[PDB]
A paper describes a structure:
CCs are quaternary structures comprising two or more α-helices supercoiled around each other with cyclic (Cn) or dihedral (Dn) symmetry. Here, we describe variants with all combinations of the aliphatic residues, Ile, Leu and Val, at a and d to give four classes of peptide: the ββ class, with a and d = Ile or Val; Lβ, a = Leu and d = Ile or Val; βL, a = Ile or Val and d = Leu; and LL, a = d = Leu. Peptides are named systematically appending the one-letter code for the amino acids at the a and d sites to “CC-[name]-“; e.g., CC-Hept becomes CC-[name]-LI. In summary, solution-phase data and X-ray crystal structures demonstrate conclusively that different classes of Type-2 coiled-coil (CC) peptides—i.e., based on abcdefg repeats with predominantly hydrophobic residues at a, d, e and g—adopt a range of distinct states.
As a = d = β-branched specify blunt-ended α-helical barrels, we explored all four combinations of Ile and Val at these sites. CC-[name]-VV, -IV, -VI and -II, were helical and bound DPH in solution consistent with α-helical barrels. Interestingly, X-ray crystallography revealed that oligomer state increased through this series: CC-[name]-VV was hexameric; [name], heptameric; and CC-[name]-II, octameric. Concomitantly, the dimensions of the internal pore diameters increased: VV, 4.8–7.7 Å; IV, 6.2–9.2 Å; and II, 9.0–11.0 Å. Finally, the modelling offers a clear explanation for why the ββ and Lβ classes exclusively form non-collapsed Cn-symmetric α-helical barrels. Sequences from both classes scored worse when threaded onto most of the slipped and collapsed structures (upper-right-hand regions of Fig. 7e).
Numbering used by the authors:
A (entry chain D), B (entry chain E), C (entry chain F), D (entry chain G), E (entry chain A), F (entry chain B), ...: 1 to 30
Amino acid sequence: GEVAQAIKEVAKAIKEVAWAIKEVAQAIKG
Amino acid sequence: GEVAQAIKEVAKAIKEVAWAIKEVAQAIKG
Amino acid sequence: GEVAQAIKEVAKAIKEVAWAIKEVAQAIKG
Amino acid sequence: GEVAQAIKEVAKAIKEVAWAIKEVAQAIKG
Amino acid sequence: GEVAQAIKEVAKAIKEVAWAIKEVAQAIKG
Amino acid sequence: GEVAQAIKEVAKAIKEVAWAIKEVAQAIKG
Amino acid sequence: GEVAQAIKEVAKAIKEVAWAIKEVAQAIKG
């Protein structure tokens, strides 16, 4: 369904946030 | 539907947050 | 509809979060 | 409606996160 | 209703995030 | 209901994010 | 149901955000 699929897109985008934060940790480490 | 499309807007906004966090990582790396 | 409109407000607020994080990147670059 | 009003509260809370991130930016520029 | 109440719980949790971020700002000011 | 229960899981996860951000604050204070 | 399952996916993604922030904390501490 379209509402479920849209919520799945929100989940995917939040995973992108997690990855970007892992990039921040990596930057801090060098 | 209007609810699904609005939820898609949330996903896109969250992607913008991920990108902004990538810029923080790059700021730290520099 | 009221639910869709409210969800759009959530999207707009998340964009505000992205802009604030960019300020953090610029502060670091500072 | 109660669901729309609750979602608007989520939006309001996300605005507070944005303000808090602005405080982090100020602290860094500090 | 249970859905509206659950969404209010999300709003409250997000406020906790805003408070946590303020602690980061204060730590940086330290 | 399952939808309310899933939304409660989202609130629980957001609280975990708040705790992690407090951990960042301790690390900075460190 | 598909909507509840999608929301659970959002919850799981938010947990990934929390774990990533813990990596940021550990990076700062080290």
